[PDB]
Design a protein that fits this description.
This protein is mainly α. It is built from 26 helices and 2 strands. It has a single domain, classed as Leucine-rich Repeat Variant (Alpha Horseshoe), CATH 1.25.10. The structure holds one RNA strand of 9 nucleotides. The PDB classes it as rna/rna binding protein.
Length: 400
RNA sequence: UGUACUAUA
């Protein structure tokens, strides 16, 4: 810190005015210092005369180099966001040029700022607060190659894409949907903890739920097509995504969401069916299997049940049949508990059995009877384990 | 008895 601003202790003075700082030419030094930053933080929140604003505009967002320097700074990025806020609230003759310049600084260094832990905050702030038409120019400056993937998988940068999805109209970011939907890109992005969050947010924004009822017909159609292209790519890699440590959450979301019912049935039919036994024994996919049992339409649910109950094991090395393998498996046991709870819920009225005016009560009673007979014959083995005890308990609880 | 994310003074 400049010596003039210090006292006898080598400590920042008291009674310091914002104008002193602005006039000194030493603003950059206060802005990257913890204590200076906090003085500025409070100073910039108060009443500001026109020249105080003018000096902030010039020194904080007026020159590219000092702009970039503050934006990438642990303390300075906050001052930048404040001054941007004040600039957008100040409708004098300089409003347009200030905003245009800001748009040019960020655009020219888009990738670098997005990837930076601190500058990515300036970007998010700018996307939210600039006039939409200029925020759209920032989106347009996003890279379209491997750098876009790196943004998506970065713990900080991914939040830039999320901000875009939240505050920018689909038309302007439609290229992101198709970028992501490219098979190799989807592969990389969904195999990553942060990338998955990006895909998830995109899916939600593209969903025709209560948050999108304000769209025009034409805009609904644009959203509908984008979703359909993304889901095609997602469902093409469905087994890989469902068994993946991160992307299983995305598959679960699609399966669990009634507003994505058509895509849920696609996933169940083309990916889960005929693979229930093996998927049930996987750490990650077992969770997708539970969601599928819970949310499948009754016609598919009956096929899933049949697949388990009539599951022929060519060479039984881990148990005589699918039910037997799953009940005593470390992950599969959860799938069976799920099947059981569903049946008990059906038979006891806690779940609808009548889908679309037609009543599958008799099928639930049949499945429950099979499970009851199996648990009865196996009670001695099952009672050795917590999962077995829970099933025995679920059944005992039903008798009442 | 079995998984993620929720990121700066």
């Amino acid at each position: 810190l400049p010596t003039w601003s210090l006292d006898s202790n080598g400590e920042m003075r008291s009674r310091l005015s914002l104008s002193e700082v602005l006039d000194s030419g030493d603003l950059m030094k206060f802005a990257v210092d913890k204590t200076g930053c906090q003085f500025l933080e409070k100073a910039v929140k108060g009443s500001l005369t026109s020249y105080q604003k003018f000096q902030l505009f010039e020194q904080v967002i007026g020159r590219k180099d000092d702009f970039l320097k503050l934006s990438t700074n642990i303390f300075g990025n906050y001052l930048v966001q404040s001054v941007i806020g004040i600039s957008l609230a100040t409708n004098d003759d300089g409003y347009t040029k200030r905003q245009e310049k800001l748009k040019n600084f960020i655009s020219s260094q888009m990738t670098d700022m997005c990837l930076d832990k601190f500058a990515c905050r300036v970007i998010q702030s700018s996307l939210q607060n600039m006039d939409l038409s200029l925020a759209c120019k920032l989106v347009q400056a996003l890279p379209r190659d491997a750098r876009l993937i790196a943004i998506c998988v970065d713990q900080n940068a991914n939040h830039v894409i999320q901000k875009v999805v939240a505050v920018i109209p689909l038309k302007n970011w439609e290229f992101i949907v198709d970028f992501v939907a490219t098979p190799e890109h989807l592969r990389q992005i969904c195999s990553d903890k942060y990338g998955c969050r990006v895909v998830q947010t995109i899916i939600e924004k593209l969903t025709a739920d209560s948050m999108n009822v304000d769209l025009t017909s034409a805009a609904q159609n644009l959203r509908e097509r984008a979703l359909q292209r993304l889901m095609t790519s997602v469902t093409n890699r469905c087994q890989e995504l469902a068994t993946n440590e991160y992307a299983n959450y995305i598959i679960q979301h699609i399966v669990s969401n009634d507003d994505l019912a058509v895509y849920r049935e696609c996933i169940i039919e083309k990916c889960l069916m005929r693979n229930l036994l093996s998927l049930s024994q996987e750490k990650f996919a077992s969770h997708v299997v539970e969601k599928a049992f819970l949310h499948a339409p009754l016609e598919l649910l009956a096929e899933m049940m049949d697949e388990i109950f009539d599951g022929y094991i060519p060479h039984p090395d881990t148990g005589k049949d699918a039910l037997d393998i799953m009940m005593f498996h470390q992950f599969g046991n959860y799938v069976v508990q799920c099947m059981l709870t569903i049946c008990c819920d059906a038979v006891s009225g806690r779940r609808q059995t009548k889908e679309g005016g037609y009543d599958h009560a008799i099928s639930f009673q049949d499945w429950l009877k099979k499970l009851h007979s199996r648990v009865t014959k196996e009670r001695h083995r099952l009672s050795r384990f917590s999962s077995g005890k829970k099933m025995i308990e679920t059944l005992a609880n039903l008798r009442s």
